[PDB]
Design a protein around this ligand. Structure first.
Ligand SMILES: C=C(O[C@H]1[C@H](O)[C@@H](CO)O[C@H](OP(=O)(O)OP(=O)(O)OC[C@H]2O[C@@H](n3ccc(=O)[nH]c3=O)[C@H](O)[C@@H]2O)[C@@H]1NC(C)=O)C(=O)O
Length: 419
Protein backbone atom coordinates (compact mmCIF):
# COMPACT_ATOMS: atom_id res chain seq x y z
CA UNK A 1 0.00 0.00 0.00
CA UNK A 2 1.40 3.35 -1.10
CA UNK A 3 2.48 5.96 1.46
CA UNK A 4 4.04 9.44 1.24
CA UNK A 5 7.24 10.31 3.12
CA UNK A 6 7.39 14.10 3.42
CA UNK A 7 10.34 16.04 4.82
CA UNK A 8 9.68 19.54 6.12
CA UNK A 9 9.72 22.45 6.49
CA UNK A 10 9.65 23.84 2.95
CA UNK A 11 8.64 27.20 1.50
CA UNK A 12 6.59 26.39 -1.62
CA UNK A 13 7.47 28.55 -4.66
CA UNK A 14 6.90 28.29 -8.39
CA UNK A 15 4.21 27.37 -10.89
CA UNK A 16 1.55 24.69 -11.09
CA UNK A 17 -0.71 23.92 -14.03
CA UNK A 18 -4.25 23.15 -12.91
CA UNK A 19 -5.81 19.90 -14.18
CA UNK A 20 -9.37 19.57 -15.42
CA UNK A 21 -12.02 19.29 -12.70
CA UNK A 22 -12.46 15.79 -11.31
CA UNK A 23 -15.98 16.87 -10.41
CA UNK A 24 -16.95 17.95 -13.92
CA UNK A 25 -15.15 15.13 -15.75
CA UNK A 26 -17.14 12.61 -13.67
CA UNK A 27 -20.71 13.68 -14.44
CA UNK A 28 -19.76 14.47 -18.05
CA UNK A 29 -18.30 10.95 -18.46
CA UNK A 30 -21.56 9.47 -17.16
CA UNK A 31 -23.64 11.80 -19.31
CA UNK A 32 -21.71 10.52 -22.35
CA UNK A 33 -23.82 7.36 -21.89
CA UNK A 34 -26.56 9.42 -23.58
CA UNK A 35 -24.49 10.09 -26.70
CA UNK A 36 -25.32 8.16 -29.89
CA UNK A 37 -22.15 9.44 -31.58
CA UNK A 38 -18.46 9.45 -30.53
CA UNK A 39 -17.39 11.99 -27.92
CA UNK A 40 -14.00 13.47 -27.05
CA UNK A 41 -13.74 14.88 -23.53
CA UNK A 42 -10.70 17.15 -23.26
CA UNK A 43 -8.65 18.17 -20.25
CA UNK A 44 -9.51 15.13 -18.13
CA UNK A 45 -7.29 14.67 -15.05
CA UNK A 46 -5.32 11.44 -14.54
CA UNK A 47 -6.66 10.08 -11.27
CA UNK A 48 -8.20 7.03 -9.65
CA UNK A 49 -11.80 8.17 -9.88
CA UNK A 50 -11.45 8.56 -13.65
CA UNK A 51 -9.99 5.06 -13.77
CA UNK A 52 -13.03 3.65 -11.91
CA UNK A 53 -15.44 5.57 -14.12
CA UNK A 54 -13.68 4.29 -17.28
CA UNK A 55 -13.92 0.76 -15.88
CA UNK A 56 -17.62 1.16 -15.13
CA UNK A 57 -18.28 2.54 -18.62
CA UNK A 58 -16.41 -0.38 -20.19
CA UNK A 59 -18.49 -2.79 -18.12
CA UNK A 60 -21.62 -1.36 -19.76
CA UNK A 61 -20.23 -2.02 -23.23
CA UNK A 62 -18.90 1.51 -23.80
CA UNK A 63 -15.73 1.81 -25.87
CA UNK A 64 -13.22 3.94 -23.96
CA UNK A 65 -9.75 5.34 -24.77
CA UNK A 66 -7.59 7.96 -23.04
CA UNK A 67 -4.21 9.67 -23.19
CA UNK A 68 -5.15 14.41 -22.18
CA UNK A 69 -8.59 13.40 -23.46
CA UNK A 70 -10.94 10.51 -22.83
CA UNK A 71 -12.62 9.21 -26.01
CA UNK A 72 -16.06 7.63 -25.57
CA UNK A 73 -18.11 5.53 -27.99
CA UNK A 74 -21.45 4.51 -26.39
CA UNK A 75 -23.03 3.24 -29.60
CA UNK A 76 -22.98 -0.36 -28.34
CA UNK A 77 -24.03 -0.30 -24.68
CA UNK A 78 -24.96 -3.91 -23.91
CA UNK A 79 -24.99 -4.21 -20.12
CA UNK A 80 -26.90 -2.08 -17.63
CA UNK A 81 -25.48 -2.65 -14.16
CA UNK A 82 -22.82 -1.07 -11.88
CA UNK A 83 -21.59 -3.83 -9.53
CA UNK A 84 -21.11 -3.71 -5.75
CA UNK A 85 -17.31 -3.86 -5.98
CA UNK A 86 -17.16 -0.73 -8.13
CA UNK A 87 -19.77 1.39 -6.33
CA UNK A 88 -17.98 0.61 -3.08
CA UNK A 89 -14.87 2.37 -4.35
CA UNK A 90 -16.76 5.29 -5.87
CA UNK A 91 -20.17 6.65 -4.74
CA UNK A 92 -20.42 8.69 -7.96
CA UNK A 93 -21.19 5.39 -9.66
CA UNK A 94 -24.82 6.31 -8.89
CA UNK A 95 -24.61 8.66 -11.90
CA UNK A 96 -24.89 5.73 -14.32
CA UNK A 97 -28.51 5.26 -13.20
CA UNK A 98 -30.18 8.23 -14.84
CA UNK A 99 -28.53 8.04 -18.27
CA UNK A 100 -29.19 4.31 -18.50
CA UNK A 101 -32.91 4.51 -17.77
CA UNK A 102 -33.35 7.67 -19.89
CA UNK A 103 -31.71 6.16 -22.98
CA UNK A 104 -32.24 2.42 -22.58
CA UNK A 105 -35.29 2.12 -20.36
CA UNK A 106 -33.35 0.26 -17.68
CA UNK A 107 -30.46 0.67 -15.28
CA UNK A 108 -29.16 -0.95 -12.11
CA UNK A 109 -26.66 0.41 -9.61
CA UNK A 110 -25.48 -1.09 -6.31
CA UNK A 111 -26.99 1.08 -3.53
CA UNK A 112 -24.15 2.95 -1.79
CA UNK A 113 -23.62 1.89 1.81
CA UNK A 114 -22.06 3.70 4.75
CA UNK A 115 -19.40 6.41 4.58
CA UNK A 116 -17.03 7.84 7.19
CA UNK A 117 -17.69 11.52 6.51
CA UNK A 118 -21.37 11.37 7.32
CA UNK A 119 -24.82 10.38 6.11
CA UNK A 120 -24.86 10.41 2.27
CA UNK A 121 -28.15 8.87 1.06
CA UNK A 122 -29.20 9.10 -2.59
CA UNK A 123 -32.94 9.52 -1.88
CA UNK A 124 -33.08 12.70 -3.98
CA UNK A 125 -31.67 10.93 -7.04
CA UNK A 126 -34.33 8.24 -6.70
CA UNK A 127 -37.10 10.74 -6.01
CA UNK A 128 -36.04 12.75 -9.05
CA UNK A 129 -36.07 9.73 -11.35
CA UNK A 130 -39.47 8.70 -9.99
CA UNK A 131 -40.87 12.16 -10.72
CA UNK A 132 -39.64 11.65 -14.28
CA UNK A 133 -41.68 8.47 -14.60
CA UNK A 134 -39.19 5.75 -13.69
CA UNK A 135 -40.24 2.78 -11.58
CA UNK A 136 -37.63 2.02 -8.94
CA UNK A 137 -37.17 -1.09 -6.82
CA UNK A 138 -34.47 -2.46 -4.51
CA UNK A 139 -33.29 -6.01 -5.26
CA UNK A 140 -30.32 -7.72 -3.62
CA UNK A 141 -28.82 -4.37 -2.73
CA UNK A 142 -29.31 -3.02 -6.25
CA UNK A 143 -31.38 0.06 -7.07
CA UNK A 144 -33.21 -0.99 -10.25
CA UNK A 145 -34.83 1.64 -12.47
CA UNK A 146 -37.11 1.13 -15.44
CA UNK A 147 -39.53 2.89 -17.76
CA UNK A 148 -41.51 1.64 -20.76
CA UNK A 149 -40.62 4.19 -23.43
CA UNK A 150 -39.42 7.74 -22.68
CA UNK A 151 -39.24 9.46 -19.31
CA UNK A 152 -41.67 12.39 -18.93
CA UNK A 153 -40.68 15.94 -18.03
CA UNK A 154 -41.80 17.20 -14.61
CA UNK A 155 -41.59 20.25 -12.30
CA UNK A 156 -39.44 19.07 -9.38
CA UNK A 157 -38.59 21.07 -6.25
CA UNK A 158 -35.48 19.83 -4.41
CA UNK A 159 -35.71 19.16 -0.64
CA UNK A 160 -31.95 19.80 -0.31
CA UNK A 161 -29.43 21.59 -2.51
CA UNK A 162 -27.73 18.56 -4.06
CA UNK A 163 -24.95 18.51 -6.62
CA UNK A 164 -25.50 14.83 -7.31
CA UNK A 165 -29.29 14.78 -7.62
CA UNK A 166 -29.26 17.92 -9.78
CA UNK A 167 -26.86 16.10 -12.20
CA UNK A 168 -28.94 12.89 -12.13
CA UNK A 169 -32.19 14.71 -12.90
CA UNK A 170 -30.74 17.17 -15.41
CA UNK A 171 -29.02 14.43 -17.39
CA UNK A 172 -31.96 12.07 -17.55
CA UNK A 173 -34.29 14.97 -18.44
CA UNK A 174 -32.46 15.66 -21.71
CA UNK A 175 -34.19 12.60 -23.27
CA UNK A 176 -37.59 12.86 -21.55
CA UNK A 177 -40.81 13.83 -23.30
CA UNK A 178 -41.54 17.44 -22.46
CA UNK A 179 -40.08 20.04 -20.15
CA UNK A 180 -38.42 19.47 -16.80
CA UNK A 181 -37.86 22.21 -14.25
CA UNK A 182 -35.43 21.63 -11.39
CA UNK A 183 -36.23 24.16 -8.65
CA UNK A 184 -33.67 24.64 -5.86
CA UNK A 185 -31.01 23.18 -8.16
CA UNK A 186 -27.32 23.11 -7.08
CA UNK A 187 -25.31 25.95 -8.71
CA UNK A 188 -21.81 24.43 -8.70
CA UNK A 189 -19.52 25.28 -11.66
CA UNK A 190 -19.46 21.56 -12.41
CA UNK A 191 -23.25 21.67 -12.97
CA UNK A 192 -22.81 24.47 -15.51
CA UNK A 193 -20.02 22.45 -17.18
CA UNK A 194 -22.13 19.28 -17.41
CA UNK A 195 -25.10 21.25 -18.77
CA UNK A 196 -22.90 22.90 -21.40
CA UNK A 197 -21.57 19.48 -22.39
CA UNK A 198 -25.13 18.21 -22.77
CA UNK A 199 -26.06 21.23 -24.87
CA UNK A 200 -23.01 20.66 -27.10
CA UNK A 201 -24.54 17.20 -27.79
CA UNK A 202 -27.86 18.73 -28.80
CA UNK A 203 -29.67 19.03 -25.46
CA UNK A 204 -31.92 22.02 -24.65
CA UNK A 205 -30.99 23.43 -21.21
CA UNK A 206 -31.17 26.91 -19.68
CA UNK A 207 -30.75 28.30 -16.18
CA UNK A 208 -27.65 26.20 -15.40
CA UNK A 209 -25.70 27.98 -12.70
CA UNK A 210 -28.90 29.37 -11.16
CA UNK A 211 -31.33 27.86 -8.65
CA UNK A 212 -33.75 26.97 -11.45
CA UNK A 213 -32.79 24.74 -14.41
CA UNK A 214 -35.14 24.14 -17.32
CA UNK A 215 -34.67 21.19 -19.69
CA UNK A 216 -36.68 20.57 -22.87
CA UNK A 217 -36.27 16.91 -23.83
CA UNK A 218 -35.09 15.86 -27.29
CA UNK A 219 -35.21 12.55 -29.14
CA UNK A 220 -31.50 11.90 -29.23
CA UNK A 221 -28.09 13.30 -28.33
CA UNK A 222 -25.25 13.13 -30.85
CA UNK A 223 -21.50 13.45 -30.36
CA UNK A 224 -18.84 16.15 -30.17
CA UNK A 225 -15.73 17.54 -28.47
CA UNK A 226 -15.84 19.24 -25.06
CA UNK A 227 -13.13 20.70 -22.78
CA UNK A 228 -13.61 20.21 -18.99
CA UNK A 229 -13.22 23.38 -16.88
CA UNK A 230 -10.29 23.77 -14.43
CA UNK A 231 -10.32 22.03 -11.04
CA UNK A 232 -11.28 24.70 -8.42
CA UNK A 233 -10.45 22.44 -5.49
CA UNK A 234 -7.02 21.51 -6.84
CA UNK A 235 -6.47 25.25 -7.39
CA UNK A 236 -7.57 26.12 -3.86
CA UNK A 237 -5.38 23.36 -2.43
CA UNK A 238 -2.26 24.71 -4.16
CA UNK A 239 -3.09 28.28 -3.17
CA UNK A 240 -3.36 27.15 0.44
CA UNK A 241 -0.07 25.25 0.15
CA UNK A 242 1.68 28.52 -0.69
CA UNK A 243 -0.32 30.49 1.90
CA UNK A 244 0.72 28.22 4.76
CA UNK A 245 4.38 28.00 3.75
CA UNK A 246 5.23 31.69 3.41
CA UNK A 247 5.43 30.96 -0.32
CA UNK A 248 4.69 32.40 -3.76
CA UNK A 249 2.94 30.61 -6.61
CA UNK A 250 1.19 31.10 -9.92
CA UNK A 251 -1.63 28.75 -10.94
CA UNK A 252 -1.91 28.31 -14.74
CA UNK A 253 -5.00 27.00 -16.60
CA UNK A 254 -7.16 28.40 -13.78
CA UNK A 255 -10.70 29.87 -13.66
CA UNK A 256 -10.70 32.62 -10.95
CA UNK A 257 -14.47 33.09 -11.02
CA UNK A 258 -15.09 29.62 -9.56
CA UNK A 259 -13.10 30.53 -6.43
CA UNK A 260 -14.38 33.83 -5.08
CA UNK A 261 -15.06 32.70 -1.53
CA UNK A 262 -11.71 30.92 -1.21
CA UNK A 263 -9.81 33.88 -2.64
CA UNK A 264 -11.51 36.29 -0.25
CA UNK A 265 -10.70 34.04 2.70
CA UNK A 266 -7.06 33.83 1.57
CA UNK A 267 -6.91 37.61 1.45
CA UNK A 268 -8.31 37.72 4.99
CA UNK A 269 -5.50 35.36 6.01
CA UNK A 270 -3.04 37.92 4.63
CA UNK A 271 -2.31 36.71 1.08
CA UNK A 272 -1.30 39.04 -1.76
CA UNK A 273 -3.43 37.78 -4.65
CA UNK A 274 -3.68 38.79 -8.32
CA UNK A 275 -5.79 37.20 -11.02
CA UNK A 276 -5.90 37.14 -14.80
CA UNK A 277 -8.24 35.51 -17.29
CA UNK A 278 -6.76 32.05 -16.72
CA UNK A 279 -4.33 32.50 -13.86
CA UNK A 280 -4.09 33.27 -10.16
CA UNK A 281 -0.98 34.44 -8.30
CA UNK A 282 -0.44 34.28 -4.52
CA UNK A 283 2.41 35.73 -2.47
CA UNK A 284 2.62 35.42 1.35
CA UNK A 285 5.77 37.55 1.46
CA UNK A 286 7.17 35.05 3.97
CA UNK A 287 4.43 35.80 6.51
CA UNK A 288 2.55 33.42 8.81
CA UNK A 289 -1.17 33.36 7.95
CA UNK A 290 -3.79 35.19 10.05
CA UNK A 291 -6.66 33.02 11.38
CA UNK A 292 -9.97 33.24 9.52
CA UNK A 293 -13.57 32.15 10.10
CA UNK A 294 -15.23 29.95 7.52
CA UNK A 295 -18.68 28.46 6.91
CA UNK A 296 -19.11 25.77 4.24
CA UNK A 297 -22.28 25.88 2.16
CA UNK A 298 -23.42 25.34 -1.45
CA UNK A 299 -21.62 27.19 -4.25
CA UNK A 300 -20.83 30.05 -4.48
CA UNK A 301 -20.26 30.03 -0.69
CA UNK A 302 -17.06 28.52 0.76
CA UNK A 303 -16.85 24.85 -0.40
CA UNK A 304 -16.73 21.83 1.91
CA UNK A 305 -14.02 20.44 -0.44
CA UNK A 306 -11.72 23.26 0.83
CA UNK A 307 -12.62 22.77 4.48
CA UNK A 308 -9.80 20.54 5.69
CA UNK A 309 -7.27 22.69 3.85
CA UNK A 310 -8.47 25.81 5.63
CA UNK A 311 -8.57 23.96 8.94
CA UNK A 312 -4.84 23.33 8.36
CA UNK A 313 -4.31 27.02 7.56
CA UNK A 314 -6.01 28.01 10.84
CA UNK A 315 -3.99 25.45 12.77
CA UNK A 316 -0.70 27.21 11.87
CA UNK A 317 -2.16 30.73 11.79
CA UNK A 318 -1.95 33.56 14.29
CA UNK A 319 -5.20 33.69 16.28
CA UNK A 320 -8.34 31.63 16.92
CA UNK A 321 -9.95 30.45 13.72
CA UNK A 322 -13.41 28.94 13.56
CA UNK A 323 -14.65 26.55 10.91
CA UNK A 324 -18.27 25.43 10.61
CA UNK A 325 -19.31 22.62 8.33
CA UNK A 326 -22.92 22.67 7.05
CA UNK A 327 -22.68 20.10 4.23
CA UNK A 328 -20.98 17.02 5.74
CA UNK A 329 -21.48 17.27 9.51
CA UNK A 330 -18.89 14.63 10.49
CA UNK A 331 -16.17 15.71 8.01
CA UNK A 332 -13.53 16.29 10.74
CA UNK A 333 -11.27 13.23 10.69
CA UNK A 334 -8.32 15.37 9.63
CA UNK A 335 -8.46 17.26 12.93
CA UNK A 336 -7.19 14.53 15.25
CA UNK A 337 -4.55 13.61 12.63
CA UNK A 338 -3.28 17.21 12.65
CA UNK A 339 -3.36 17.21 16.45
CA UNK A 340 -0.94 14.23 16.29
CA UNK A 341 1.38 16.75 14.55
CA UNK A 342 1.11 19.31 17.35
CA UNK A 343 -2.03 21.24 16.39
CA UNK A 344 -4.60 22.43 18.95
CA UNK A 345 -8.35 22.39 18.34
CA UNK A 346 -11.72 21.35 19.75
CA UNK A 347 -14.71 20.00 17.84
CA UNK A 348 -18.15 21.13 19.11
CA UNK A 349 -21.00 19.80 17.02
CA UNK A 350 -20.30 20.84 13.39
CA UNK A 351 -17.71 23.46 14.31
CA UNK A 352 -13.98 23.29 14.93
CA UNK A 353 -12.32 25.91 17.13
CA UNK A 354 -8.67 26.32 16.09
CA UNK A 355 -5.80 27.60 18.22
CA UNK A 356 -2.96 28.33 15.79
CA UNK A 357 0.57 27.19 16.68
CA UNK A 358 3.93 28.41 15.40
CA UNK A 359 5.04 25.03 14.11
CA UNK A 360 3.85 21.48 13.42
CA UNK A 361 6.05 18.40 14.02
CA UNK A 362 6.40 15.39 11.74
CA UNK A 363 4.41 12.30 12.70
CA UNK A 364 2.69 9.26 11.25
CA UNK A 365 -0.83 10.12 10.04
CA UNK A 366 -3.62 8.38 8.15
CA UNK A 367 -5.44 9.51 4.97
CA UNK A 368 -9.18 8.67 4.76
CA UNK A 369 -10.83 11.33 2.54
CA UNK A 370 -10.10 11.79 -1.23
CA UNK A 371 -10.26 15.59 -1.01
CA UNK A 372 -9.76 16.44 2.67
CA UNK A 373 -6.71 14.21 3.26
CA UNK A 374 -4.50 16.24 0.91
CA UNK A 375 -4.38 18.41 4.05
CA UNK A 376 -2.09 15.87 5.69
CA UNK A 377 0.38 16.00 2.81
CA UNK A 378 0.38 19.81 2.92
CA UNK A 379 0.95 19.67 6.69
CA UNK A 380 3.94 17.40 6.11
CA UNK A 381 5.40 20.04 3.80
CA UNK A 382 5.51 22.68 6.52
CA UNK A 383 6.08 20.55 9.61
CA UNK A 384 9.46 20.09 11.28
CA UNK A 385 10.91 16.72 10.41
CA UNK A 386 9.47 13.66 8.72
CA UNK A 387 5.78 13.01 8.20
CA UNK A 388 4.51 9.70 6.88
CA UNK A 389 1.04 9.71 5.33
CA UNK A 390 -0.49 6.22 5.14
CA UNK A 391 -3.25 5.07 2.77
CA UNK A 392 -2.49 7.65 0.09
CA UNK A 393 -4.69 5.78 -2.38
CA UNK A 394 -7.35 8.18 -1.06
CA UNK A 395 -5.38 11.15 -2.38
CA UNK A 396 -4.77 9.32 -5.67
CA UNK A 397 -8.54 9.18 -6.19
CA UNK A 398 -8.87 12.95 -6.07
CA UNK A 399 -5.60 14.53 -7.24
CA UNK A 400 -3.45 14.07 -10.34
CA UNK A 401 0.18 13.28 -9.36
CA UNK A 402 0.06 15.57 -6.33
CA UNK A 403 3.63 14.66 -5.34
CA UNK A 404 4.92 15.76 -8.76
CA UNK A 405 3.18 19.11 -8.57
CA UNK A 406 4.35 19.68 -4.98
CA UNK A 407 7.87 18.58 -5.86
CA UNK A 408 7.98 21.20 -8.64
CA UNK A 409 7.22 23.78 -5.91
CA UNK A 410 10.16 22.64 -3.80
CA UNK A 411 8.59 19.94 -1.65
CA UNK A 412 10.60 17.00 -0.35
CA UNK A 413 8.22 14.14 -0.94
CA UNK A 414 8.61 10.49 -1.75
CA UNK A 415 6.08 7.91 -2.84
CA UNK A 416 7.00 4.81 -0.84
CA UNK A 417 5.67 1.56 -2.26
CA UNK A 418 4.41 -1.21 -0.03
CA UNK A 419 3.13 -3.41 -2.86
C1 LIG B 1 -16.22 14.38 -1.63
C2 LIG B 1 -16.27 14.63 -2.96
O1 LIG B 1 -16.81 15.82 -3.58
C3 LIG B 1 -18.23 16.06 -3.40
C4 LIG B 1 -18.51 17.46 -2.80
O2 LIG B 1 -17.91 17.51 -1.52
C5 LIG B 1 -20.08 17.63 -2.68
C6 LIG B 1 -20.45 19.02 -2.07
O3 LIG B 1 -19.82 20.06 -2.80
O4 LIG B 1 -20.64 17.53 -3.99
C7 LIG B 1 -20.42 16.28 -4.67
O5 LIG B 1 -20.89 15.25 -3.89
P1 LIG B 1 -22.47 14.83 -3.76
O6 LIG B 1 -23.07 15.02 -5.09
O7 LIG B 1 -22.52 13.52 -3.05
O8 LIG B 1 -23.05 15.90 -2.74
P2 LIG B 1 -24.45 16.57 -2.62
O9 LIG B 1 -25.47 15.66 -3.25
O10 LIG B 1 -24.44 18.03 -2.95
O11 LIG B 1 -24.78 16.51 -0.98
C8 LIG B 1 -24.99 17.63 -0.23
C9 LIG B 1 -25.79 17.19 1.06
O12 LIG B 1 -27.05 16.61 0.68
C10 LIG B 1 -27.19 15.31 1.19
N1 LIG B 1 -27.99 14.47 0.23
C11 LIG B 1 -27.57 14.42 -1.12
C12 LIG B 1 -28.23 13.68 -2.06
C13 LIG B 1 -29.42 12.92 -1.70
O13 LIG B 1 -30.07 12.23 -2.45
N2 LIG B 1 -29.83 12.99 -0.31
C14 LIG B 1 -29.14 13.75 0.65
O14 LIG B 1 -29.57 13.75 1.81
C15 LIG B 1 -25.74 14.80 1.40
O15 LIG B 1 -25.81 13.72 2.31
C16 LIG B 1 -25.06 16.11 1.89
O16 LIG B 1 -25.35 16.27 3.26
C17 LIG B 1 -18.90 16.03 -4.80
N3 LIG B 1 -18.70 14.76 -5.46
C18 LIG B 1 -18.77 14.69 -6.82
C19 LIG B 1 -18.51 13.28 -7.42
O17 LIG B 1 -18.99 15.61 -7.58
C20 LIG B 1 -15.63 13.59 -3.93
O18 LIG B 1 -14.80 14.10 -4.66
O19 LIG B 1 -15.96 12.36 -3.91
Amino acid sequence: MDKFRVQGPTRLQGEVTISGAKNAALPILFAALLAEEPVEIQNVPKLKDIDTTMKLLTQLGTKVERXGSVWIDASNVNNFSAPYDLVKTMRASIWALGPLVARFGQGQVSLPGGCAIGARPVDLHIFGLEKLGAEIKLEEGYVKASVNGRLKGAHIVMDKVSVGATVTIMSAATLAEGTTIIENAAREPEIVDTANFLVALGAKISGQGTDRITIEGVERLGGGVYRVLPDRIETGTFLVAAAISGGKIVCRNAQPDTLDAVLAKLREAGADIETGEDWISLDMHGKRPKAVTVRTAPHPAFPTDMQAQFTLLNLVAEGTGVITETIFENRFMHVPELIRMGAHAEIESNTVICHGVEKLSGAQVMATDLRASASLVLAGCIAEGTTVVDRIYHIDRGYERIEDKLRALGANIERVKGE
